[PDB]
Amino acid sequence: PYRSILDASLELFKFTIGMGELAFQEQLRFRGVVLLLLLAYVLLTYVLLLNMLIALMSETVNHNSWSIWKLQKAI
Amino acid sequence: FDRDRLFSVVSRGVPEELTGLLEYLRWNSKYLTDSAYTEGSTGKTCLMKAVLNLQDGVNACIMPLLQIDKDSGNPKLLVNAQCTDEFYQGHSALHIAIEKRSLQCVKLLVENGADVHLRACGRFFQKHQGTCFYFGELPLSLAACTKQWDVVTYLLENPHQPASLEATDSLGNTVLHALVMIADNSPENSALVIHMYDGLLQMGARLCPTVQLEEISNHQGLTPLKLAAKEGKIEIFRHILQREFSGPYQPLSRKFTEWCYGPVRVSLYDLSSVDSWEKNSVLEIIAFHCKSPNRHRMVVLEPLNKLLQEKWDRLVSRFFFNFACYLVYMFIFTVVAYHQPSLFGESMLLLGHILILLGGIYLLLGQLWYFWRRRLFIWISFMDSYFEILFLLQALLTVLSQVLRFMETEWYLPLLVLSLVLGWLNLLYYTRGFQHTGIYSVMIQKVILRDLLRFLLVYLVFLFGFAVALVSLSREARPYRSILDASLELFKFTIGMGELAFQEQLRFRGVVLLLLLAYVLLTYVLLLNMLIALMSETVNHNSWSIWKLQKAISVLEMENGYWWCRRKKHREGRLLKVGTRTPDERWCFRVEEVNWAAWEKTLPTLSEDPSGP
Amino acid sequence: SVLEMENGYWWCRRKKHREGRLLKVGTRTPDERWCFRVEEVNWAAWEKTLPTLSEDPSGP
Amino acid sequence: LRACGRFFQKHQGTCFYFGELPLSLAACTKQWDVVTYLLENPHQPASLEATDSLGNTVLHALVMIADNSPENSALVIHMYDGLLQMGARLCPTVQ
């Protein structure tokens, strides 16, 4: 399962790309705690992605960019 | 000559039919204040009934009735009578005269020795839920809460019964406390309260100059500025903190102006019972003792914004020092948890465990001291005192796991892992030390949280129902064997690993496929509804002031130091003389402004020459 | 939702209660009407021009 | 008379830079009578061009303190025009 920090970080990062493995591993002495901890990570990760989406929508809807492009043209 | 005859004559205002009252009252050896003449069980007398209805603001039956009462030889004066019942107690005839907007009637009753200081401490006059109108239960305060200037002017300058502008009620409130206590954020009420607060202050300047009306406290120990801060009344809060008067009414001002040079002006705001040197300052009351949604609104107003900015600029070095200490403690706690044995290196691991125990005990003691000092702050505001709760929780877990390490049991490692996880989630507190991450941290618990809880409730209901459905339907043979396994398989659709296959092993397989498709559709409905509702809540947007409130709470805790050492507390501002009231020296805060439109040199200045900070 | 609940269940019909109080509003000989008590606070209406049914405040 | 003190130099903190000249001080105060009297008095006439320690003239000083606010911008624009039209008929040799 998880043997190193790099491997566990790679397995945990795959939840954002849609390949997060979530299984009830019947090989560890503490398995329900690992399952609950994975669920908590999934919840907090969805909090982070949702917060980023909401904050960036809020920044955009309260909108300039045409003149910034013209400044890039002048440079 | 029964009571109903009196209460019918005085309801008409005719004075001629009062004949026969003096003779019968002298013959029967009775009194006009007796319970026989009282209107029912409520306690109402004849004069209050005569006052209650008026013909063009005047009654021709009041003065003859008072003459009859004077001629009757009453041991107790009828104009000072009170109702004395459960709901409507202490309500005198002068209050009703003030109510009906008849200055002439108020004059008519006060000419004959009406007691001005009569407290009306009934249930209707006390502030409570239901039906009430609290106004300070005094005729002076009643006129102050009615928006009447003639009546209060006559009451404060009459030769018969002068009204003391300071007068405590049963709750301890004065006229200023009562005028602060009933206030809205609405433009109609706020202008009323502000203008007549100013009027009463300027009246008390020349009526009772020996006493300080602002520096008085009620039974709760709050000045009207502190009462406005605690009750959340912000419209009078700004005006009290920012009031400037030019002329003879100079000492009752708080926004003095030191000097002007063209467009730049240096002005001194007042910090009297405002800065954190006082035990019950306005900043502490706003941050900790106020239960109102307008808390963050009361922080970003001058001079509190610049004062708290100065305090943060002075304490940011200790803020980042605490951040560095917590980061080092979590690095040591992570290294030890990474190198746990199977359940020189051993001595180093024992030293690491000792350091973990010491840090956990330190954090637990600090959090317990904070909870002892701020026990009401949790009930007042959960969304401002939750990290501390988390800073408590893992801390005791940090202790508890070590206890389970001492007993050499199985569950010491899961508790250590949860301590590590909760400690790394507790690192987001110090993100309030920067402005961008500080604004970011507001959204993570305020708006998204309620939507996430309701979404989790609906999703858990749907997930449990569908899990039981696929468990019960898949038992018959021609996958899902338990509720936990089926819930785990069904939850994977939200993370992109939902297995959707036509299982050719069950007797009912098309029903299972259709049921899975229905679950997918309803799950997408739930996620889409959450997204739409949270976008709708966000687009109709505050958060900058909420971050500033978190800054003010952060600095006020840091000025108290740690639990083991109490730091010295420094006064903000300078002690400068603002006038000859014999000198009037005040502690003040220097605020610099630039105004390119104010080009009139009319107002005087304290200092004739510019000077630096 | 509430209007369906005032009809009770299909097996038992619940008693239905009148809302408000029966009070006299004028001599039209009396004009007694069933009415609902509504409390309001207005800090701008300071003119005592309109007459009132009751001269003294009372509770609900 | 140049007033080259720390208060009159442009820096962070407390200051009011205006070109450290009485002509430029009247130009940064929104006063037309005082500048009109200073530029056309027979005793001590005021040269509209006059370098300060930073090299700024009255026009440079009037540009240097300016906001994007409507109150300051109208002031600066109108009296920039006024000083230019005054220098047209007062010192027409120089630009």
Ligand SMILES: CCCCCCCCCC(=O)OC[C@H](COP(=O)([O-])OCCN)OC(=O)CCCCCCCCC
């Ligand atoms: C041997 C006895 C020594 C006692 C004194 C130790 C020095 C004081 C440590 C300290 O500054 O604690 C503050 C820090 C942050 O807590 P908080 O007030 O921000 O709480 C905010 C909650 N909202 O809290 C921590 O970081 C706890 C860490 C404990 C170990 C410190 C190691 C220092 C390494 C240099």
